[PDB]
């Protein structure tokens, strides 16, 4: 019966209970093979040789064109539009009128009146709603992410990254000569196998690399040229199992809850969002329990986007962000999970006498919902933060999670993350029956580096 | 340059070294989603509720027709053809002229002069070679397994299994009434959503179920009807991550090495097999090291097929099998791996000081080659067997492997499995650097049951 989010929530009871018991299944990264060699060697290669990341299938693309394209972005992003010219990209972050993050994505300024958004569904849905209902003179082509269980896939564009300490060597070999390293997120072009390929300056683990894209038809020509040229430097392709664990080392939180489930000013959006949207159908997992869905919201300062906020243009939520004191907001950190506790979690899987075991911690990514929310506790047992993305780095031989915690907690402090859900687990299909564990974890910098 | 297996081996040096260092990557089970709920709940369901197994994509189908179809099978199988009529299936097992297993598959006798083979590539390749070169009056359609990394799949037929303690309840609900349980591997039909669907009597974990198949076009009608009717009984679909671990509880060894790399009588076959065949391109993994590829061969008695051998028809390898004493052959067993040792293997992944860790043991399937060969040792350190398929059962909370061991070793005996490869690991792309561990393991019955 329901055809929009507002109807789903009205018929669904408590919104937190609905989402924490959703029957959707796992947030999937589709089409790309799980592994090409193995996820451990693939993780190792982005720190020690070079990798080809295949980004063609897991993200939504919005092609945004027309006279009002830039005004649509400016009106909805915290980011400064001043001085923004073609061939520069931005990490677009929209907030609600209440100041909470909806999502984020990369917005490429390709040419005058021509932009592309690449990212997850929530910020794309927001852009489409405002383009639709706000009277902007704009034209949008929506190209959804590929189906997460296709079983018998095409996009408008392919998108790759070449990364690692040897990435620039591979890139210049492909180019046929020296390639200037522009400033981060500046765009230009390079040669691959006779094609002019547009580039986006990128990098990771302290080494510069590129994102590259083009029309879907040249995808295999490009890929084979990259793999061929990269053999000299140890370049290997990375599969969908390893790929999303990279952000545990980077620090980008992919999955803040879209903060759109409450609020009178957001009712029109909820009536617009379909009942099978990401927002209506997805799931929340982890140990943090509140009866108020707003307790799962974050604002930009809490997850590392404070420096993007610029009060130099009108935008949705500007007044709410101006009223925030940035100096007292929770801060994004990396939590380094205690390895003895990790061994205890895995050991319980092989205990034939125990009534229960600890929640299964998949590797290298242990998330078991689309939005992750584990409680972070201090020595006294107070909730002091929210852990939001969890997994393991073969490079560090450490389990790690990305969290937002009370600002006055120093690096090096040992907190605990409550791992697992209450009462044997929610009804999500990703959750086997289990008991919880308070995992010791050391507050560490973001991007991750070893602490104490 | 090489276009057949014989050329590959001639140019490849020692055959064991070639296969144990193959660059192929992982033996994949493709197209089907890795998980629908989670592999732990999916394993649990085939013992506690019901499951839908999607078998449409991972096996080769050979449609074999014509006057000499049955003679082709009889001439190449150890199995008795006497009394074989349409609507009975057999587990077809071919051996070489030297008595060693090539492979196995299920052969359906659909009608007079009409058979279908379903199974892995090695026995299909053997059937095709003999159909091609032996002058049989036969016609064959080869329908390969689906591509193991497609990324943008069709078969001639879909194939499902409905299994679990509640499978027969689901089956009769679909049928619309009582359905007779025929003898194992006898074929008949049932109703699903108005279609007449052919059936194969099957079962697992002590409960009867069915394999069902039909033309590829009716696949979704059938699947949706099954999932719909099965909700009442807790039926869930199983993904490709959990599915192949089922045989650790069943006892079927899927992957004996095709014993075709040596022998003057097999040179013609090696010249026929393509250079990109399964046999030429695949990999051997594990701790068992010999310089003679024949030390990796098994004969039917060693892996549970002794009872199929019937000296009532002429067949390839009959004379070799008649010369074997079945009472002294190695015997298939289940090894139950020690859970403290398993915890130690996983614990080494989180040790930030250790120079090395133990070989990664993936879950629920830990195989890291197409053919698995781990050394099984006694208390004195002699090799007494070969472990051939390895993983973990959430139903048992135990790591398990399927092995063939010296016949005089009693159930309940504690042996060790050498887990991991020598010298930091072979050059296979599935192998991260690691040290070995001698894992304690208790000889247990096959199909698995708890011992002592």
PDB file of N, CA and C in Angstrom, chain B residues 239-326:
ATOM      1  N   UNK B 239      23.099 -18.187  -0.407  1.00  0.00           N
ATOM      2  CA  UNK B 239      24.006 -17.546  -1.344  1.00  0.00           C
ATOM      3  C   UNK B 239      25.247 -18.389  -1.637  1.00  0.00           C
ATOM      4  N   UNK B 240      26.111 -17.848  -2.509  1.00  0.00           N
ATOM      5  CA  UNK B 240      27.269 -18.615  -2.968  1.00  0.00           C
ATOM      6  C   UNK B 240      28.376 -18.716  -1.921  1.00  0.00           C
ATOM      7  N   UNK B 241      28.354 -17.890  -0.885  1.00  0.00           N
ATOM      8  CA  UNK B 241      29.353 -18.021   0.175  1.00  0.00           C
ATOM      9  C   UNK B 241      29.093 -19.267   1.028  1.00  0.00           C
ATOM     10  N   UNK B 242      27.853 -19.437   1.489  1.00  0.00           N
ATOM     11  CA  UNK B 242      27.505 -20.577   2.337  1.00  0.00           C
ATOM     12  C   UNK B 242      27.411 -21.871   1.538  1.00  0.00           C
ATOM     13  N   UNK B 243      26.834 -21.814   0.334  1.00  0.00           N
ATOM     14  CA  UNK B 243      26.424 -23.033  -0.370  1.00  0.00           C
ATOM     15  C   UNK B 243      27.508 -24.102  -0.444  1.00  0.00           C
ATOM     16  N   UNK B 244      28.728 -23.821  -0.920  1.00  0.00           N
ATOM     17  CA  UNK B 244      29.702 -24.912  -1.105  1.00  0.00           C
ATOM     18  C   UNK B 244      30.247 -25.472   0.197  1.00  0.00           C
ATOM     19  N   UNK B 245      30.083 -24.767   1.319  1.00  0.00           N
ATOM     20  CA  UNK B 245      30.445 -25.330   2.615  1.00  0.00           C
ATOM     21  C   UNK B 245      29.520 -26.471   3.034  1.00  0.00           C
ATOM     22  N   UNK B 246      28.374 -26.638   2.380  1.00  0.00           N
ATOM     23  CA  UNK B 246      27.480 -27.709   2.804  1.00  0.00           C
ATOM     24  C   UNK B 246      28.164 -29.067   2.700  1.00  0.00           C
ATOM     25  N   UNK B 247      29.063 -29.240   1.729  1.00  0.00           N
ATOM     26  CA  UNK B 247      29.642 -30.557   1.528  1.00  0.00           C
ATOM     27  C   UNK B 247      30.588 -30.946   2.653  1.00  0.00           C
ATOM     28  N   UNK B 248      31.015 -29.993   3.475  1.00  0.00           N
ATOM     29  CA  UNK B 248      31.788 -30.363   4.659  1.00  0.00           C
ATOM     30  C   UNK B 248      30.966 -31.196   5.632  1.00  0.00           C
ATOM     31  N   UNK B 249      29.659 -30.962   5.664  1.00  0.00           N
ATOM     32  CA  UNK B 249      28.727 -31.753   6.457  1.00  0.00           C
ATOM     33  C   UNK B 249      28.235 -32.978   5.699  1.00  0.00           C
ATOM     34  N   UNK B 250      28.191 -32.923   4.360  1.00  0.00           N
ATOM     35  CA  UNK B 250      27.773 -34.057   3.528  1.00  0.00           C
ATOM     36  C   UNK B 250      28.869 -35.104   3.352  1.00  0.00           C
ATOM     37  N   UNK B 251      30.094 -34.680   3.075  1.00  0.00           N
ATOM     38  CA  UNK B 251      31.191 -35.591   2.819  1.00  0.00           C
ATOM     39  C   UNK B 251      31.610 -35.742   1.366  1.00  0.00           C
ATOM     40  N   UNK B 252      30.931 -35.110   0.405  1.00  0.00           N
ATOM     41  CA  UNK B 252      31.353 -35.201  -0.994  1.00  0.00           C
ATOM     42  C   UNK B 252      32.593 -34.336  -1.226  1.00  0.00           C
ATOM     43  N   UNK B 253      33.671 -34.938  -1.722  1.00  0.00           N
ATOM     44  CA  UNK B 253      34.879 -34.193  -2.081  1.00  0.00           C
ATOM     45  C   UNK B 253      34.702 -33.689  -3.505  1.00  0.00           C
ATOM     46  N   UNK B 254      34.524 -32.380  -3.713  1.00  0.00           N
ATOM     47  CA  UNK B 254      34.224 -31.877  -5.057  1.00  0.00           C
ATOM     48  C   UNK B 254      35.411 -31.889  -6.001  1.00  0.00           C
ATOM     49  N   UNK B 255      36.644 -31.882  -5.493  1.00  0.00           N
ATOM     50  CA  UNK B 255      37.791 -31.426  -6.290  1.00  0.00           C
ATOM     51  C   UNK B 255      39.003 -32.354  -6.232  1.00  0.00           C
ATOM     52  N   UNK B 256      38.842 -33.640  -6.540  1.00  0.00           N
ATOM     53  CA  UNK B 256      40.040 -34.464  -6.743  1.00  0.00           C
ATOM     54  C   UNK B 256      40.791 -33.957  -7.971  1.00  0.00           C
ATOM     55  N   UNK B 257      42.119 -34.060  -7.938  1.00  0.00           N
ATOM     56  CA  UNK B 257      42.911 -33.630  -9.096  1.00  0.00           C
ATOM     57  C   UNK B 257      42.605 -34.527 -10.293  1.00  0.00           C
ATOM     58  N   UNK B 258      42.264 -33.974 -11.454  1.00  0.00           N
ATOM     59  CA  UNK B 258      42.044 -34.843 -12.618  1.00  0.00           C
ATOM     60  C   UNK B 258      43.344 -35.557 -12.959  1.00  0.00           C
ATOM     61  N   UNK B 259      43.315 -36.885 -12.909  1.00  0.00           N
ATOM     62  CA  UNK B 259      44.567 -37.642 -12.878  1.00  0.00           C
ATOM     63  C   UNK B 259      45.131 -37.886 -14.277  1.00  0.00           C
ATOM     64  N   UNK B 260      45.297 -36.821 -15.064  1.00  0.00           N
ATOM     65  CA  UNK B 260      45.530 -36.983 -16.490  1.00  0.00           C
ATOM     66  C   UNK B 260      46.855 -36.378 -16.950  1.00  0.00           C
ATOM     67  N   UNK B 261      47.733 -35.995 -16.025  1.00  0.00           N
ATOM     68  CA  UNK B 261      48.949 -35.263 -16.361  1.00  0.00           C
ATOM     69  C   UNK B 261      50.130 -36.157 -16.727  1.00  0.00           C
ATOM     70  N   UNK B 262      50.011 -37.466 -16.519  1.00  0.00           N
ATOM     71  CA  UNK B 262      51.071 -38.431 -16.797  1.00  0.00           C
ATOM     72  C   UNK B 262      50.451 -39.632 -17.489  1.00  0.00           C
ATOM     73  N   UNK B 263      51.293 -40.473 -18.081  1.00  0.00           N
ATOM     74  CA  UNK B 263      50.788 -41.702 -18.662  1.00  0.00           C
ATOM     75  C   UNK B 263      50.720 -41.676 -20.175  1.00  0.00           C
ATOM     76  N   UNK B 264      51.353 -42.670 -20.811  1.00  0.00           N
ATOM     77  CA  UNK B 264      51.380 -42.731 -22.268  1.00  0.00           C
ATOM     78  C   UNK B 264      49.988 -42.858 -22.849  1.00  0.00           C
ATOM     79  N   UNK B 265      49.097 -43.588 -22.164  1.00  0.00           N
ATOM     80  CA  UNK B 265      47.756 -43.769 -22.704  1.00  0.00           C
ATOM     81  C   UNK B 265      46.906 -42.513 -22.601  1.00  0.00           C
ATOM     82  N   UNK B 266      47.391 -41.479 -21.926  1.00  0.00           N
ATOM     83  CA  UNK B 266      46.642 -40.242 -21.759  1.00  0.00           C
ATOM     84  C   UNK B 266      47.240 -39.093 -22.561  1.00  0.00           C
ATOM     85  N   UNK B 267      48.298 -39.347 -23.337  1.00  0.00           N
ATOM     86  CA  UNK B 267      48.907 -38.278 -24.113  1.00  0.00           C
ATOM     87  C   UNK B 267      47.931 -37.717 -25.137  1.00  0.00           C
ATOM     88  N   UNK B 268      47.151 -38.588 -25.795  1.00  0.00           N
ATOM     89  CA  UNK B 268      46.198 -38.097 -26.793  1.00  0.00           C
ATOM     90  C   UNK B 268      45.173 -37.148 -26.161  1.00  0.00           C
ATOM     91  N   UNK B 269      44.714 -37.473 -24.954  1.00  0.00           N
ATOM     92  CA  UNK B 269      43.795 -36.593 -24.236  1.00  0.00           C
ATOM     93  C   UNK B 269      44.460 -35.256 -23.906  1.00  0.00           C
ATOM     94  N   UNK B 270      45.711 -35.289 -23.438  1.00  0.00           N
ATOM     95  CA  UNK B 270      46.424 -34.051 -23.111  1.00  0.00           C
ATOM     96  C   UNK B 270      46.622 -33.174 -24.347  1.00  0.00           C
ATOM     97  N   UNK B 271      46.846 -33.786 -25.514  1.00  0.00           N
ATOM     98  CA  UNK B 271      46.945 -33.013 -26.757  1.00  0.00           C
ATOM     99  C   UNK B 271      45.598 -32.445 -27.189  1.00  0.00           C
ATOM    100  N   UNK B 272      44.499 -33.054 -26.744  1.00  0.00           N
ATOM    101  CA  UNK B 272      43.158 -32.578 -27.070  1.00  0.00           C
ATOM    102  C   UNK B 272      42.722 -31.458 -26.135  1.00  0.00           C
ATOM    103  N   UNK B 273      43.079 -31.542 -24.850  1.00  0.00           N
ATOM    104  CA  UNK B 273      42.634 -30.530 -23.878  1.00  0.00           C
ATOM    105  C   UNK B 273      43.236 -29.164 -24.205  1.00  0.00           C
ATOM    106  N   UNK B 274      42.438 -28.095 -24.244  1.00  0.00           N
ATOM    107  CA  UNK B 274      42.981 -26.771 -24.583  1.00  0.00           C
ATOM    108  C   UNK B 274      43.964 -26.280 -23.533  1.00  0.00           C
ATOM    109  N   UNK B 275      44.820 -25.337 -23.946  1.00  0.00           N
ATOM    110  CA  UNK B 275      45.746 -24.696 -23.010  1.00  0.00           C
ATOM    111  C   UNK B 275      45.040 -23.830 -21.965  1.00  0.00           C
ATOM    112  N   UNK B 276      43.832 -23.356 -22.231  1.00  0.00           N
ATOM    113  CA  UNK B 276      43.092 -22.629 -21.204  1.00  0.00           C
ATOM    114  C   UNK B 276      42.047 -23.503 -20.523  1.00  0.00           C
ATOM    115  N   UNK B 277      42.163 -24.821 -20.651  1.00  0.00           N
ATOM    116  CA  UNK B 277      41.257 -25.702 -19.931  1.00  0.00           C
ATOM    117  C   UNK B 277      41.428 -25.543 -18.418  1.00  0.00           C
ATOM    118  N   UNK B 278      40.441 -26.064 -17.688  1.00  0.00           N
ATOM    119  CA  UNK B 278      40.523 -26.171 -16.234  1.00  0.00           C
ATOM    120  C   UNK B 278      41.801 -26.886 -15.820  1.00  0.00           C
ATOM    121  N   UNK B 279      42.115 -27.983 -16.506  1.00  0.00           N
ATOM    122  CA  UNK B 279      43.258 -28.812 -16.130  1.00  0.00           C
ATOM    123  C   UNK B 279      44.594 -28.094 -16.353  1.00  0.00           C
ATOM    124  N   UNK B 280      44.701 -27.310 -17.421  1.00  0.00           N
ATOM    125  CA  UNK B 280      45.964 -26.647 -17.713  1.00  0.00           C
ATOM    126  C   UNK B 280      46.183 -25.416 -16.846  1.00  0.00           C
ATOM    127  N   UNK B 281      45.101 -24.723 -16.485  1.00  0.00           N
ATOM    128  CA  UNK B 281      45.194 -23.376 -15.934  1.00  0.00           C
ATOM    129  C   UNK B 281      45.017 -23.324 -14.426  1.00  0.00           C
ATOM    130  N   UNK B 282      44.446 -24.371 -13.828  1.00  0.00           N
ATOM    131  CA  UNK B 282      44.041 -24.362 -12.440  1.00  0.00           C
ATOM    132  C   UNK B 282      45.242 -24.444 -11.525  1.00  0.00           C
ATOM    133  N   UNK B 283      44.958 -24.594 -10.227  1.00  0.00           N
ATOM    134  CA  UNK B 283      46.002 -24.508  -9.211  1.00  0.00           C
ATOM    135  C   UNK B 283      45.840 -25.610  -8.172  1.00  0.00           C
ATOM    136  N   UNK B 284      46.960 -26.000  -7.555  1.00  0.00           N
ATOM    137  CA  UNK B 284      46.975 -26.887  -6.393  1.00  0.00           C
ATOM    138  C   UNK B 284      47.449 -26.079  -5.197  1.00  0.00           C
ATOM    139  N   UNK B 285      46.780 -26.227  -4.050  1.00  0.00           N
ATOM    140  CA  UNK B 285      47.198 -25.528  -2.850  1.00  0.00           C
ATOM    141  C   UNK B 285      47.278 -26.458  -1.654  1.00  0.00           C
ATOM    142  N   UNK B 286      48.069 -26.050  -0.667  1.00  0.00           N
ATOM    143  CA  UNK B 286      48.147 -26.759   0.593  1.00  0.00           C
ATOM    144  C   UNK B 286      49.537 -27.296   0.883  1.00  0.00           C
ATOM    145  N   UNK B 287      49.639 -27.978   2.025  1.00  0.00           N
ATOM    146  CA  UNK B 287      50.952 -28.298   2.567  1.00  0.00           C
ATOM    147  C   UNK B 287      51.555 -29.568   1.998  1.00  0.00           C
ATOM    148  N   UNK B 288      50.812 -30.370   1.242  1.00  0.00           N
ATOM    149  CA  UNK B 288      51.390 -31.618   0.774  1.00  0.00           C
ATOM    150  C   UNK B 288      52.304 -31.343  -0.415  1.00  0.00           C
ATOM    151  N   UNK B 289      53.578 -31.714  -0.286  1.00  0.00           N
ATOM    152  CA  UNK B 289      54.589 -31.444  -1.307  1.00  0.00           C
ATOM    153  C   UNK B 289      55.170 -32.764  -1.793  1.00  0.00           C
ATOM    154  N   UNK B 290      55.095 -32.996  -3.101  1.00  0.00           N
ATOM    155  CA  UNK B 290      55.850 -34.058  -3.753  1.00  0.00           C
ATOM    156  C   UNK B 290      56.294 -33.524  -5.100  1.00  0.00           C
ATOM    157  N   UNK B 291      57.391 -34.063  -5.624  1.00  0.00           N
ATOM    158  CA  UNK B 291      57.794 -33.663  -6.967  1.00  0.00           C
ATOM    159  C   UNK B 291      57.090 -34.470  -8.043  1.00  0.00           C
ATOM    160  N   UNK B 292      56.291 -35.469  -7.663  1.00  0.00           N
ATOM    161  CA  UNK B 292      55.599 -36.335  -8.612  1.00  0.00           C
ATOM    162  C   UNK B 292      54.112 -36.014  -8.594  1.00  0.00           C
ATOM    163  N   UNK B 293      53.584 -35.529  -9.726  1.00  0.00           N
ATOM    164  CA  UNK B 293      52.172 -35.139  -9.748  1.00  0.00           C
ATOM    165  C   UNK B 293      51.274 -36.330  -9.440  1.00  0.00           C
ATOM    166  N   UNK B 294      51.741 -37.555  -9.704  1.00  0.00           N
ATOM    167  CA  UNK B 294      50.902 -38.725  -9.432  1.00  0.00           C
ATOM    168  C   UNK B 294      50.610 -38.906  -7.952  1.00  0.00           C
ATOM    169  N   UNK B 295      51.450 -38.369  -7.069  1.00  0.00           N
ATOM    170  CA  UNK B 295      51.181 -38.467  -5.638  1.00  0.00           C
ATOM    171  C   UNK B 295      49.955 -37.672  -5.208  1.00  0.00           C
ATOM    172  N   UNK B 296      49.390 -36.850  -6.099  1.00  0.00           N
ATOM    173  CA  UNK B 296      48.172 -36.104  -5.828  1.00  0.00           C
ATOM    174  C   UNK B 296      46.934 -36.815  -6.361  1.00  0.00           C
ATOM    175  N   UNK B 297      47.108 -37.920  -7.076  1.00  0.00           N
ATOM    176  CA  UNK B 297      45.988 -38.647  -7.647  1.00  0.00           C
ATOM    177  C   UNK B 297      45.273 -39.435  -6.562  1.00  0.00           C
ATOM    178  N   UNK B 298      43.961 -39.624  -6.734  1.00  0.00           N
ATOM    179  CA  UNK B 298      43.232 -40.603  -5.935  1.00  0.00           C
ATOM    180  C   UNK B 298      42.527 -41.588  -6.852  1.00  0.00           C
ATOM    181  N   UNK B 299      42.255 -42.776  -6.318  1.00  0.00           N
ATOM    182  CA  UNK B 299      41.428 -43.752  -7.002  1.00  0.00           C
ATOM    183  C   UNK B 299      40.048 -43.798  -6.339  1.00  0.00           C
ATOM    184  N   UNK B 300      39.053 -44.429  -6.979  1.00  0.00           N
ATOM    185  CA  UNK B 300      37.673 -44.307  -6.450  1.00  0.00           C
ATOM    186  C   UNK B 300      37.513 -44.780  -5.017  1.00  0.00           C
ATOM    187  N   UNK B 301      38.215 -45.849  -4.624  1.00  0.00           N
ATOM    188  CA  UNK B 301      38.042 -46.397  -3.282  1.00  0.00           C
ATOM    189  C   UNK B 301      38.469 -45.407  -2.205  1.00  0.00           C
ATOM    190  N   UNK B 302      39.431 -44.540  -2.521  1.00  0.00           N
ATOM    191  CA  UNK B 302      39.986 -43.624  -1.533  1.00  0.00           C
ATOM    192  C   UNK B 302      39.075 -42.449  -1.213  1.00  0.00           C
ATOM    193  N   UNK B 303      38.098 -42.152  -2.053  1.00  0.00           N
ATOM    194  CA  UNK B 303      37.269 -40.984  -1.764  1.00  0.00           C
ATOM    195  C   UNK B 303      35.790 -41.341  -1.714  1.00  0.00           C
ATOM    196  N   UNK B 304      35.470 -42.592  -1.386  1.00  0.00           N
ATOM    197  CA  UNK B 304      34.098 -42.964  -1.097  1.00  0.00           C
ATOM    198  C   UNK B 304      33.327 -43.579  -2.241  1.00  0.00           C
ATOM    199  N   UNK B 305      33.947 -43.779  -3.400  1.00  0.00           N
ATOM    200  CA  UNK B 305      33.253 -44.332  -4.560  1.00  0.00           C
ATOM    201  C   UNK B 305      33.481 -45.834  -4.752  1.00  0.00           C
ATOM    202  N   UNK B 306      34.213 -46.504  -3.866  1.00  0.00           N
ATOM    203  CA  UNK B 306      34.341 -47.951  -3.936  1.00  0.00           C
ATOM    204  C   UNK B 306      33.045 -48.723  -4.199  1.00  0.00           C
ATOM    205  N   UNK B 307      31.986 -48.414  -3.446  1.00  0.00           N
ATOM    206  CA  UNK B 307      30.699 -49.100  -3.667  1.00  0.00           C
ATOM    207  C   UNK B 307      30.086 -48.877  -5.041  1.00  0.00           C
ATOM    208  N   UNK B 308      30.519 -47.866  -5.802  1.00  0.00           N
ATOM    209  CA  UNK B 308      29.986 -47.677  -7.148  1.00  0.00           C
ATOM    210  C   UNK B 308      30.623 -48.613  -8.165  1.00  0.00           C
ATOM    211  N   UNK B 309      31.831 -49.095  -7.893  1.00  0.00           N
ATOM    212  CA  UNK B 309      32.568 -49.906  -8.854  1.00  0.00           C
ATOM    213  C   UNK B 309      31.837 -51.235  -9.039  1.00  0.00           C
ATOM    214  N   UNK B 310      31.497 -51.564 -10.280  1.00  0.00           N
ATOM    215  CA  UNK B 310      30.812 -52.813 -10.582  1.00  0.00           C
ATOM    216  C   UNK B 310      31.460 -53.444 -11.802  1.00  0.00           C
ATOM    217  N   UNK B 311      32.065 -54.619 -11.615  1.00  0.00           N
ATOM    218  CA  UNK B 311      32.760 -55.305 -12.706  1.00  0.00           C
ATOM    219  C   UNK B 311      31.775 -56.147 -13.520  1.00  0.00           C
ATOM    220  N   UNK B 312      30.737 -55.475 -14.042  1.00  0.00           N
ATOM    221  CA  UNK B 312      29.690 -56.136 -14.819  1.00  0.00           C
ATOM    222  C   UNK B 312      29.559 -55.548 -16.215  1.00  0.00           C
ATOM    223  N   UNK B 313      30.531 -54.756 -16.651  1.00  0.00           N
ATOM    224  CA  UNK B 313      30.536 -54.081 -17.939  1.00  0.00           C
ATOM    225  C   UNK B 313      31.979 -53.707 -18.232  1.00  0.00           C
ATOM    226  N   UNK B 314      32.317 -53.581 -19.517  1.00  0.00           N
ATOM    227  CA  UNK B 314      33.662 -53.142 -19.879  1.00  0.00           C
ATOM    228  C   UNK B 314      33.762 -51.638 -19.683  1.00  0.00           C
ATOM    229  N   UNK B 315      34.867 -51.183 -19.103  1.00  0.00           N
ATOM    230  CA  UNK B 315      35.059 -49.742 -18.982  1.00  0.00           C
ATOM    231  C   UNK B 315      36.538 -49.423 -18.860  1.00  0.00           C
ATOM    232  N   UNK B 316      36.869 -48.173 -19.207  1.00  0.00           N
ATOM    233  CA  UNK B 316      38.238 -47.685 -19.095  1.00  0.00           C
ATOM    234  C   UNK B 316      38.704 -47.751 -17.649  1.00  0.00           C
ATOM    235  N   UNK B 317      39.860 -48.391 -17.431  1.00  0.00           N
ATOM    236  CA  UNK B 317      40.400 -48.566 -16.092  1.00  0.00           C
ATOM    237  C   UNK B 317      39.880 -49.774 -15.321  1.00  0.00           C
ATOM    238  N   UNK B 318      39.000 -50.579 -15.911  1.00  0.00           N
ATOM    239  CA  UNK B 318      38.488 -51.745 -15.187  1.00  0.00           C
ATOM    240  C   UNK B 318      39.622 -52.662 -14.731  1.00  0.00           C
ATOM    241  N   UNK B 319      40.564 -52.962 -15.625  1.00  0.00           N
ATOM    242  CA  UNK B 319      41.653 -53.866 -15.249  1.00  0.00           C
ATOM    243  C   UNK B 319      42.468 -53.306 -14.089  1.00  0.00           C
ATOM    244  N   UNK B 320      42.729 -51.990 -14.089  1.00  0.00           N
ATOM    245  CA  UNK B 320      43.444 -51.390 -12.963  1.00  0.00           C
ATOM    246  C   UNK B 320      42.653 -51.517 -11.663  1.00  0.00           C
ATOM    247  N   UNK B 321      41.337 -51.313 -11.713  1.00  0.00           N
ATOM    248  CA  UNK B 321      40.585 -51.396 -10.460  1.00  0.00           C
ATOM    249  C   UNK B 321      40.462 -52.840  -9.983  1.00  0.00           C
ATOM    250  N   UNK B 322      40.378 -53.793 -10.907  1.00  0.00           N
ATOM    251  CA  UNK B 322      40.322 -55.191 -10.476  1.00  0.00           C
ATOM    252  C   UNK B 322      41.590 -55.613  -9.741  1.00  0.00           C
ATOM    253  N   UNK B 323      42.718 -54.941  -9.990  1.00  0.00           N
ATOM    254  CA  UNK B 323      43.994 -55.307  -9.374  1.00  0.00           C
ATOM    255  C   UNK B 323      44.193 -54.679  -8.001  1.00  0.00           C
ATOM    256  N   UNK B 324      43.320 -53.746  -7.618  1.00  0.00           N
ATOM    257  CA  UNK B 324      43.345 -53.074  -6.325  1.00  0.00           C
ATOM    258  C   UNK B 324      42.670 -53.958  -5.283  1.00  0.00           C
ATOM    259  N   UNK B 325      43.245 -54.017  -4.078  1.00  0.00           N
ATOM    260  CA  UNK B 325      42.559 -54.618  -2.938  1.00  0.00           C
ATOM    261  C   UNK B 325      41.777 -53.537  -2.196  1.00  0.00           C
ATOM    262  N   UNK B 326      40.442 -53.533  -2.253  1.00  0.00           N
ATOM    263  CA  UNK B 326      39.684 -52.448  -1.603  1.00  0.00           C
ATOM    264  C   UNK B 326      39.911 -52.360  -0.110  1.00  0.00           C
TER     265      UNK B 326
END
